[PDB]
Amino acid sequence: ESQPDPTPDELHKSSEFTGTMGNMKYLYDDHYVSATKVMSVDKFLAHDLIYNISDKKLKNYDKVKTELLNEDLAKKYKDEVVDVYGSNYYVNCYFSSKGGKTCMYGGITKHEGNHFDNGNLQNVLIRVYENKRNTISFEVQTDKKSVTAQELDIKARNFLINKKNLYEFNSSPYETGYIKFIENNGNTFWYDMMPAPGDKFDQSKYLMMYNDNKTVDSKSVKIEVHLTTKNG
Ligand SMILES: [Zn+2]
């Protein structure tokens, strides 16, 4: 059930990536869509939901479309009152053709029953390993009991870009990186933090890993960020 951890050879290497690492940084550096109590208004493909959500900080969109793994997830949430949290993109964001528009994947949670009885916020510790040493540890926060892994991942990388220079314009000071979640039923899963090898970063394709809408229990999940400089 749980995903095996990284094999050494499969992790993406920043030395094999020849595009602009600022195109990855852009997805996580104080950049996310956020909304409360919205209900989808429209669809494009059978697995996606379009919401009326307005860009809260820069004035770039009044529509957002999320793509989900399958038509079942889309039906489940179509008429639910939901909260939205996730990373958006504009390159190759295909809508029909019928006030900017932005795209994304997953990020949706039912609002009702999903907040803490106190109105308080749940702190979630991220432990950071560099060349296998737990170097620093820091907390992100959420108001949600059952929170997307996407939302936690975005918060963690936002911090690390400022604190650790996780991504810079040209490249990264790290060669490899993966973020691992560990749930209190023992389940584990992880996301490669580095772009696929090549001379072009594909935003849409990279973000597509969040389409499963995976949620985790904020009060109990543990998170590990594992980074190497290993090459230099
Ligand atoms: Zn809510």
PDB file of C-alpha atoms and ligand atoms in Angstrom:
ATOM      1  CA  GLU A   1       0.000   0.000   0.000  1.00  0.00           C
ATOM      2  CA  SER A   2       2.586   2.616   1.032  1.00  0.00           C
ATOM      3  CA  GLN A   3       4.926   3.822  -1.736  1.00  0.00           C
ATOM      4  CA  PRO A   4       8.482   2.467  -1.528  1.00  0.00           C
ATOM      5  CA  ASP A   5      10.991   5.358  -0.904  1.00  0.00           C
ATOM      6  CA  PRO A   6      13.244   6.739  -3.635  1.00  0.00           C
ATOM      7  CA  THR A   7      15.445   4.566  -5.472  1.00  0.00           C
ATOM      8  CA  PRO A   8      18.880   6.315  -5.832  1.00  0.00           C
ATOM      9  CA  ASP A   9      18.795   6.355  -9.589  1.00  0.00           C
ATOM     10  CA  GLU A  10      15.214   7.554 -10.132  1.00  0.00           C
ATOM     11  CA  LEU A  11      15.315  10.955  -8.371  1.00  0.00           C
ATOM     12  CA  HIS A  12      15.541  13.937 -10.789  1.00  0.00           C
ATOM     13  CA  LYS A  13      18.974  15.580 -10.823  1.00  0.00           C
ATOM     14  CA  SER A  14      19.228  19.403 -11.121  1.00  0.00           C
ATOM     15  CA  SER A  15      22.514  18.916 -13.045  1.00  0.00           C
ATOM     16  CA  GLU A  16      20.506  17.206 -15.816  1.00  0.00           C
ATOM     17  CA  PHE A  17      18.075  20.079 -15.977  1.00  0.00           C
ATOM     18  CA  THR A  18      19.089  22.744 -18.368  1.00  0.00           C
ATOM     19  CA  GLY A  19      16.040  25.026 -18.440  1.00  0.00           C
ATOM     20  CA  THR A  20      15.333  27.895 -16.068  1.00  0.00           C
ATOM     21  CA  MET A  21      14.977  26.835 -12.446  1.00  0.00           C
ATOM     22  CA  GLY A  22      13.079  30.113 -11.811  1.00  0.00           C
ATOM     23  CA  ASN A  23      10.097  28.416 -13.610  1.00  0.00           C
ATOM     24  CA  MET A  24       9.954  25.935 -10.728  1.00  0.00           C
ATOM     25  CA  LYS A  25      10.580  28.615  -8.073  1.00  0.00           C
ATOM     26  CA  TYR A  26       7.672  30.586  -9.536  1.00  0.00           C
ATOM     27  CA  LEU A  27       5.215  27.765  -8.677  1.00  0.00           C
ATOM     28  CA  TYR A  28       6.082  27.915  -4.891  1.00  0.00           C
ATOM     29  CA  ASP A  29       7.404  31.443  -4.096  1.00  0.00           C
ATOM     30  CA  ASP A  30       4.502  33.115  -2.385  1.00  0.00           C
ATOM     31  CA  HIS A  31       2.213  31.774  -5.144  1.00  0.00           C
ATOM     32  CA  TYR A  32      -1.039  29.837  -4.654  1.00  0.00           C
ATOM     33  CA  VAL A  33      -4.767  30.090  -5.240  1.00  0.00           C
ATOM     34  CA  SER A  34      -6.902  30.181  -2.125  1.00  0.00           C
ATOM     35  CA  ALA A  35     -10.697  30.248  -1.637  1.00  0.00           C
ATOM     36  CA  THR A  36     -13.356  29.567   0.975  1.00  0.00           C
ATOM     37  CA  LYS A  37     -16.808  28.124   0.630  1.00  0.00           C
ATOM     38  CA  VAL A  38     -17.058  28.128  -3.206  1.00  0.00           C
ATOM     39  CA  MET A  39     -19.048  25.707  -5.365  1.00  0.00           C
ATOM     40  CA  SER A  40     -18.006  24.836  -8.894  1.00  0.00           C
ATOM     41  CA  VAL A  41     -19.882  26.664 -11.659  1.00  0.00           C
ATOM     42  CA  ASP A  42     -18.829  24.897 -14.847  1.00  0.00           C
ATOM     43  CA  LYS A  43     -16.628  22.119 -16.341  1.00  0.00           C
ATOM     44  CA  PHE A  44     -14.376  21.685 -19.406  1.00  0.00           C
ATOM     45  CA  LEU A  45     -13.128  18.081 -19.476  1.00  0.00           C
ATOM     46  CA  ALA A  46     -15.065  15.452 -17.525  1.00  0.00           C
ATOM     47  CA  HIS A  47     -12.477  15.420 -14.701  1.00  0.00           C
ATOM     48  CA  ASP A  48     -12.281  19.168 -13.962  1.00  0.00           C
ATOM     49  CA  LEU A  49     -14.242  21.795 -12.073  1.00  0.00           C
ATOM     50  CA  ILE A  50     -14.232  25.562 -12.799  1.00  0.00           C
ATOM     51  CA  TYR A  51     -14.706  27.964  -9.905  1.00  0.00           C
ATOM     52  CA  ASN A  52     -15.294  31.723  -9.695  1.00  0.00           C
ATOM     53  CA  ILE A  53     -12.242  32.666  -7.612  1.00  0.00           C
ATOM     54  CA  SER A  54     -10.595  36.068  -7.802  1.00  0.00           C
ATOM     55  CA  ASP A  55      -6.892  36.689  -7.634  1.00  0.00           C
ATOM     56  CA  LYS A  56      -6.494  38.027  -4.107  1.00  0.00           C
ATOM     57  CA  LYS A  57      -3.047  39.626  -4.428  1.00  0.00           C
ATOM     58  CA  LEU A  58      -2.092  40.537  -8.064  1.00  0.00           C
ATOM     59  CA  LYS A  59      -5.277  40.892 -10.352  1.00  0.00           C
ATOM     60  CA  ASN A  60      -4.514  38.054 -12.784  1.00  0.00           C
ATOM     61  CA  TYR A  61      -7.685  35.882 -12.800  1.00  0.00           C
ATOM     62  CA  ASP A  62     -11.366  35.683 -11.854  1.00  0.00           C
ATOM     63  CA  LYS A  63     -11.792  32.026 -12.959  1.00  0.00           C
ATOM     64  CA  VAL A  64      -9.932  28.929 -11.844  1.00  0.00           C
ATOM     65  CA  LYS A  65     -10.261  25.490 -13.259  1.00  0.00           C
ATOM     66  CA  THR A  66      -8.890  22.447 -11.168  1.00  0.00           C
ATOM     67  CA  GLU A  67      -8.139  19.148 -12.875  1.00  0.00           C
ATOM     68  CA  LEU A  68      -8.590  15.953 -10.892  1.00  0.00           C
ATOM     69  CA  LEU A  69      -7.329  12.423 -11.399  1.00  0.00           C
ATOM     70  CA  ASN A  70     -10.691  11.048 -12.751  1.00  0.00           C
ATOM     71  CA  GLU A  71     -14.379  11.777 -13.349  1.00  0.00           C
ATOM     72  CA  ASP A  72     -15.352  10.197  -9.979  1.00  0.00           C
ATOM     73  CA  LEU A  73     -13.392  12.787  -7.995  1.00  0.00           C
ATOM     74  CA  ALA A  74     -14.980  15.516 -10.163  1.00  0.00           C
ATOM     75  CA  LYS A  75     -18.519  14.293  -9.520  1.00  0.00           C
ATOM     76  CA  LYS A  76     -17.854  13.926  -5.813  1.00  0.00           C
ATOM     77  CA  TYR A  77     -16.918  17.595  -5.459  1.00  0.00           C
ATOM     78  CA  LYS A  78     -19.001  19.270  -8.214  1.00  0.00           C
ATOM     79  CA  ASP A  79     -21.840  20.469  -5.973  1.00  0.00           C
ATOM     80  CA  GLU A  80     -20.013  20.516  -2.639  1.00  0.00           C
ATOM     81  CA  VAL A  81     -19.235  23.756  -0.805  1.00  0.00           C
ATOM     82  CA  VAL A  82     -15.370  23.432  -0.743  1.00  0.00           C
ATOM     83  CA  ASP A  83     -12.174  25.237   0.226  1.00  0.00           C
ATOM     84  CA  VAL A  84      -9.413  25.478  -2.377  1.00  0.00           C
ATOM     85  CA  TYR A  85      -5.640  25.587  -1.938  1.00  0.00           C
ATOM     86  CA  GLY A  86      -3.039  24.950  -4.646  1.00  0.00           C
ATOM     87  CA  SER A  87      -0.400  26.080  -7.102  1.00  0.00           C
ATOM     88  CA  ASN A  88      -1.568  27.681 -10.364  1.00  0.00           C
ATOM     89  CA  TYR A  89      -0.144  27.971 -13.848  1.00  0.00           C
ATOM     90  CA  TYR A  90      -0.822  29.947 -17.059  1.00  0.00           C
ATOM     91  CA  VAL A  91       1.390  28.245 -19.620  1.00  0.00           C
ATOM     92  CA  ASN A  92      -0.744  25.820 -21.580  1.00  0.00           C
ATOM     93  CA  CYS A  93      -3.810  26.437 -19.370  1.00  0.00           C
ATOM     94  CA  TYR A  94      -6.525  25.211 -21.824  1.00  0.00           C
ATOM     95  CA  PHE A  95     -10.069  26.277 -21.342  1.00  0.00           C
ATOM     96  CA  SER A  96     -12.860  26.167 -23.904  1.00  0.00           C
ATOM     97  CA  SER A  97     -13.203  29.717 -25.254  1.00  0.00           C
ATOM     98  CA  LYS A  98     -16.544  30.923 -23.974  1.00  0.00           C
ATOM     99  CA  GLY A  99     -11.075  38.484 -16.449  1.00  0.00           C
ATOM    100  CA  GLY A 100      -8.105  36.214 -16.606  1.00  0.00           C
ATOM    101  CA  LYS A 101      -8.222  32.437 -16.220  1.00  0.00           C
ATOM    102  CA  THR A 102      -5.784  30.180 -14.408  1.00  0.00           C
ATOM    103  CA  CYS A 103      -5.241  26.468 -14.142  1.00  0.00           C
ATOM    104  CA  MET A 104      -4.310  23.964 -11.440  1.00  0.00           C
ATOM    105  CA  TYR A 105      -4.725  20.385 -10.070  1.00  0.00           C
ATOM    106  CA  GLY A 106      -6.505  18.951  -6.998  1.00  0.00           C
ATOM    107  CA  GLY A 107      -6.430  21.300  -3.974  1.00  0.00           C
ATOM    108  CA  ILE A 108     -10.018  20.835  -2.986  1.00  0.00           C
ATOM    109  CA  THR A 109     -11.551  20.008   0.439  1.00  0.00           C
ATOM    110  CA  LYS A 110     -15.108  19.948   1.796  1.00  0.00           C
ATOM    111  CA  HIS A 111     -15.574  22.976   4.082  1.00  0.00           C
ATOM    112  CA  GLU A 112     -18.200  21.564   6.413  1.00  0.00           C
ATOM    113  CA  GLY A 113     -16.834  19.593   9.342  1.00  0.00           C
ATOM    114  CA  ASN A 114     -13.215  20.263   8.341  1.00  0.00           C
ATOM    115  CA  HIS A 115     -12.139  22.919  10.881  1.00  0.00           C
ATOM    116  CA  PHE A 116     -10.881  22.833  14.428  1.00  0.00           C
ATOM    117  CA  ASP A 117     -13.557  23.193  17.089  1.00  0.00           C
ATOM    118  CA  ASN A 118     -11.338  26.000  18.688  1.00  0.00           C
ATOM    119  CA  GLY A 119     -10.803  28.119  15.407  1.00  0.00           C
ATOM    120  CA  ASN A 120      -7.221  27.507  16.076  1.00  0.00           C
ATOM    121  CA  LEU A 121      -4.621  26.584  13.533  1.00  0.00           C
ATOM    122  CA  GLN A 122      -2.837  23.206  13.204  1.00  0.00           C
ATOM    123  CA  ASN A 123       0.993  23.324  13.205  1.00  0.00           C
ATOM    124  CA  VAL A 124       2.730  20.693  11.108  1.00  0.00           C
ATOM    125  CA  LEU A 125       6.420  20.040  11.576  1.00  0.00           C
ATOM    126  CA  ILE A 126       8.653  19.680   8.526  1.00  0.00           C
ATOM    127  CA  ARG A 127      12.025  18.061   9.243  1.00  0.00           C
ATOM    128  CA  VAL A 128      14.708  18.846   6.700  1.00  0.00           C
ATOM    129  CA  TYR A 129      17.619  16.514   5.926  1.00  0.00           C
ATOM    130  CA  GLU A 130      20.702  17.605   3.937  1.00  0.00           C
ATOM    131  CA  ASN A 131      23.030  14.791   2.892  1.00  0.00           C
ATOM    132  CA  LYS A 132      21.169  12.656   5.470  1.00  0.00           C
ATOM    133  CA  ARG A 133      21.621  15.073   8.448  1.00  0.00           C
ATOM    134  CA  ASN A 134      18.471  16.638   9.930  1.00  0.00           C
ATOM    135  CA  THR A 135      19.767  20.118   9.547  1.00  0.00           C
ATOM    136  CA  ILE A 136      16.715  22.325  10.431  1.00  0.00           C
ATOM    137  CA  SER A 137      13.020  21.783  11.334  1.00  0.00           C
ATOM    138  CA  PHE A 138      10.187  24.276  11.015  1.00  0.00           C
ATOM    139  CA  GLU A 139       6.399  24.399  11.328  1.00  0.00           C
ATOM    140  CA  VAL A 140       3.859  25.379   8.652  1.00  0.00           C
ATOM    141  CA  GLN A 141       0.207  26.011   9.626  1.00  0.00           C
ATOM    142  CA  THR A 142      -3.293  25.198   8.333  1.00  0.00           C
ATOM    143  CA  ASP A 143      -6.837  25.758   9.525  1.00  0.00           C
ATOM    144  CA  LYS A 144      -7.926  22.437   7.999  1.00  0.00           C
ATOM    145  CA  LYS A 145      -8.331  19.093   9.794  1.00  0.00           C
ATOM    146  CA  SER A 146      -8.006  17.089   6.621  1.00  0.00           C
ATOM    147  CA  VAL A 147      -5.632  19.115   4.461  1.00  0.00           C
ATOM    148  CA  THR A 148      -4.308  18.469   0.937  1.00  0.00           C
ATOM    149  CA  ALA A 149      -0.754  17.267   0.809  1.00  0.00           C
ATOM    150  CA  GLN A 150      -0.500  19.937  -1.921  1.00  0.00           C
ATOM    151  CA  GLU A 151      -1.148  22.737   0.559  1.00  0.00           C
ATOM    152  CA  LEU A 152       1.459  21.437   3.030  1.00  0.00           C
ATOM    153  CA  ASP A 153       4.049  20.853   0.266  1.00  0.00           C
ATOM    154  CA  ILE A 154       3.538  24.469  -1.090  1.00  0.00           C
ATOM    155  CA  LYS A 155       3.960  25.974   2.412  1.00  0.00           C
ATOM    156  CA  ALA A 156       7.062  23.887   3.032  1.00  0.00           C
ATOM    157  CA  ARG A 157       8.729  24.852  -0.267  1.00  0.00           C
ATOM    158  CA  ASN A 158       7.788  28.551   0.147  1.00  0.00           C
ATOM    159  CA  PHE A 159       9.750  28.566   3.444  1.00  0.00           C
ATOM    160  CA  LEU A 160      12.715  26.691   1.994  1.00  0.00           C
ATOM    161  CA  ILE A 161      13.026  28.937  -1.001  1.00  0.00           C
ATOM    162  CA  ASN A 162      13.597  31.921   1.387  1.00  0.00           C
ATOM    163  CA  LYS A 163      15.553  30.113   4.156  1.00  0.00           C
ATOM    164  CA  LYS A 164      17.559  27.695   2.041  1.00  0.00           C
ATOM    165  CA  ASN A 165      17.495  29.034  -1.483  1.00  0.00           C
ATOM    166  CA  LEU A 166      15.846  25.752  -2.450  1.00  0.00           C
ATOM    167  CA  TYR A 167      15.308  27.055  -6.004  1.00  0.00           C
ATOM    168  CA  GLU A 168      17.008  30.072  -7.633  1.00  0.00           C
ATOM    169  CA  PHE A 169      16.670  31.757 -11.027  1.00  0.00           C
ATOM    170  CA  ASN A 170      19.355  29.796 -12.921  1.00  0.00           C
ATOM    171  CA  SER A 171      19.571  26.545 -10.879  1.00  0.00           C
ATOM    172  CA  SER A 172      19.444  25.033  -7.346  1.00  0.00           C
ATOM    173  CA  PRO A 173      22.233  24.549  -4.776  1.00  0.00           C
ATOM    174  CA  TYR A 174      20.656  21.104  -4.368  1.00  0.00           C
ATOM    175  CA  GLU A 175      21.136  18.211  -6.791  1.00  0.00           C
ATOM    176  CA  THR A 176      18.260  15.989  -5.583  1.00  0.00           C
ATOM    177  CA  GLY A 177      15.196  16.492  -3.389  1.00  0.00           C
ATOM    178  CA  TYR A 178      12.023  14.719  -2.321  1.00  0.00           C
ATOM    179  CA  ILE A 179       9.323  15.573   0.174  1.00  0.00           C
ATOM    180  CA  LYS A 180       7.968  12.515   2.069  1.00  0.00           C
ATOM    181  CA  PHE A 181       4.701  12.358   4.032  1.00  0.00           C
ATOM    182  CA  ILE A 182       4.160   9.723   6.779  1.00  0.00           C
ATOM    183  CA  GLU A 183       0.522   9.259   7.886  1.00  0.00           C
ATOM    184  CA  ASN A 184      -0.526   7.862  11.336  1.00  0.00           C
ATOM    185  CA  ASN A 185      -1.877   4.681   9.719  1.00  0.00           C
ATOM    186  CA  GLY A 186       1.731   3.980   8.580  1.00  0.00           C
ATOM    187  CA  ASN A 187       1.036   4.975   4.931  1.00  0.00           C
ATOM    188  CA  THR A 188       3.932   6.754   3.181  1.00  0.00           C
ATOM    189  CA  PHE A 189       4.228   8.678  -0.152  1.00  0.00           C
ATOM    190  CA  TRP A 190       6.725  11.229  -1.631  1.00  0.00           C
ATOM    191  CA  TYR A 191       7.084  13.796  -4.426  1.00  0.00           C
ATOM    192  CA  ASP A 192      10.250  14.556  -6.418  1.00  0.00           C
ATOM    193  CA  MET A 193      11.020  18.257  -5.819  1.00  0.00           C
ATOM    194  CA  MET A 194      13.325  18.709  -8.917  1.00  0.00           C
ATOM    195  CA  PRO A 195      12.346  19.245 -12.590  1.00  0.00           C
ATOM    196  CA  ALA A 196      12.525  16.396 -15.120  1.00  0.00           C
ATOM    197  CA  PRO A 197      15.772  16.255 -17.137  1.00  0.00           C
ATOM    198  CA  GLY A 198      15.936  18.413 -20.268  1.00  0.00           C
ATOM    199  CA  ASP A 199      15.980  21.998 -21.635  1.00  0.00           C
ATOM    200  CA  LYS A 200      12.383  22.918 -20.959  1.00  0.00           C
ATOM    201  CA  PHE A 201      10.408  22.846 -17.695  1.00  0.00           C
ATOM    202  CA  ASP A 202       6.752  21.836 -18.134  1.00  0.00           C
ATOM    203  CA  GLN A 203       4.757  23.461 -15.356  1.00  0.00           C
ATOM    204  CA  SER A 204       1.454  21.780 -16.113  1.00  0.00           C
ATOM    205  CA  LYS A 205       3.022  18.384 -16.399  1.00  0.00           C
ATOM    206  CA  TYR A 206       4.900  18.834 -13.080  1.00  0.00           C
ATOM    207  CA  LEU A 207       1.855  20.013 -11.105  1.00  0.00           C
ATOM    208  CA  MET A 208      -0.207  17.129 -12.460  1.00  0.00           C
ATOM    209  CA  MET A 209       1.080  14.946  -9.571  1.00  0.00           C
ATOM    210  CA  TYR A 210      -1.394  16.790  -7.245  1.00  0.00           C
ATOM    211  CA  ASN A 211      -4.397  15.629  -9.300  1.00  0.00           C
ATOM    212  CA  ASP A 212      -5.156  12.718  -6.862  1.00  0.00           C
ATOM    213  CA  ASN A 213      -6.339  15.416  -4.401  1.00  0.00           C
ATOM    214  CA  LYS A 214      -4.583  13.390  -1.639  1.00  0.00           C
ATOM    215  CA  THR A 215      -5.509  14.538   1.844  1.00  0.00           C
ATOM    216  CA  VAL A 216      -3.743  13.906   5.120  1.00  0.00           C
ATOM    217  CA  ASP A 217      -4.731  14.475   8.731  1.00  0.00           C
ATOM    218  CA  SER A 218      -2.946  17.685   9.754  1.00  0.00           C
ATOM    219  CA  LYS A 219      -2.903  16.941  13.500  1.00  0.00           C
ATOM    220  CA  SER A 220      -0.907  13.713  13.018  1.00  0.00           C
ATOM    221  CA  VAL A 221       0.946  13.499   9.659  1.00  0.00           C
ATOM    222  CA  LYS A 222       4.758  13.816   9.717  1.00  0.00           C
ATOM    223  CA  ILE A 223       6.763  15.312   6.881  1.00  0.00           C
ATOM    224  CA  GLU A 224      10.413  14.934   5.875  1.00  0.00           C
ATOM    225  CA  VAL A 225      12.222  16.934   3.242  1.00  0.00           C
ATOM    226  CA  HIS A 226      15.317  15.051   1.999  1.00  0.00           C
ATOM    227  CA  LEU A 227      17.843  17.038   0.050  1.00  0.00           C
ATOM    228  CA  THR A 228      21.259  16.279  -1.396  1.00  0.00           C
ATOM    229  CA  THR A 229      24.070  18.471  -2.464  1.00  0.00           C
ATOM    230  CA  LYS A 230      25.704  14.919  -3.020  1.00  0.00           C
ATOM    231  CA  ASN A 231      27.120  16.108  -6.392  1.00  0.00           C
ATOM    232  CA  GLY A 232      28.129  19.564  -4.965  1.00  0.00           C
TER     233      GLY A 232
HETATM  234 ZN    ZN B   1     -13.541  26.024   5.283  1.00  0.00          ZN
END
